[PDB]
Amino acid sequence: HGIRMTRISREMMKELLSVYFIMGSNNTKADPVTVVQKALKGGATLYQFREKGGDALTGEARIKFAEKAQAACREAGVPFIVNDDVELALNLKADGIHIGQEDANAKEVRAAIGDMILGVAAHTMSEVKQAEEDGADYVGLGPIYPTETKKDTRAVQGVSLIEAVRRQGISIPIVGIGGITIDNAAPVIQAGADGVSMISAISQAEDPESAARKFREEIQTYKTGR
Ligand SMILES: Cc1ncc(C[n+]2csc(CCOP(=O)(O)O)c2C)c(N)n1
């Protein structure tokens, strides 16, 4: 449960991606930390701290919120991943960092974080292959379904890229993202993904704990069945 002195195994990474909850203070009307605690109690297997955009906390307020979210993750025994902010990830001794195509180059990031978990968002086959070559531990593929949680998102692709990646014999850990709900997660796993990631399906649920628990149960069933 400490800092990694060796890169994560693919088997372990795939287990962590099962129910990957992502959240920032501006993704819910409830108390931010409380929602994160409920998501973890319910069954989320991985959590990503993503605090950006308008209304998002900044400065010291953002750092203190990150510390509380990381504490919640430690209590639940779930890894804490930071989005974009490499310096914050190192400063908090986070378990990982997630970056996109317009963020810091993956090769640069991999060198700066040692053996920490590294996730990269990809939308094309070329980007997936480049991410693997750069040292990524997993790729986030989407948007699978329509979503407006994230402002400028690329064209909806369903599970097409997930399928294409597996058909080429690429076994890198994959997590699907974008408009995923309790009702539409099955196809994502069936296509070859190792889990599903979401924001609103849990953060804006009238019952975050039950939603996370439903996800955890469903994904387990889907993985055993494919
Ligand atoms: C693992 C990973 N893959 C992709 C992204 C970028 N991203 C693409 S769609 C989306 C919103 C989903 O919200 P909703 O579930 O409410 O549609 C985000 C944050 C990321 N941060 N982490």
Ligand SMILES: [Mg+2]
């Ligand atoms: Mg980014």
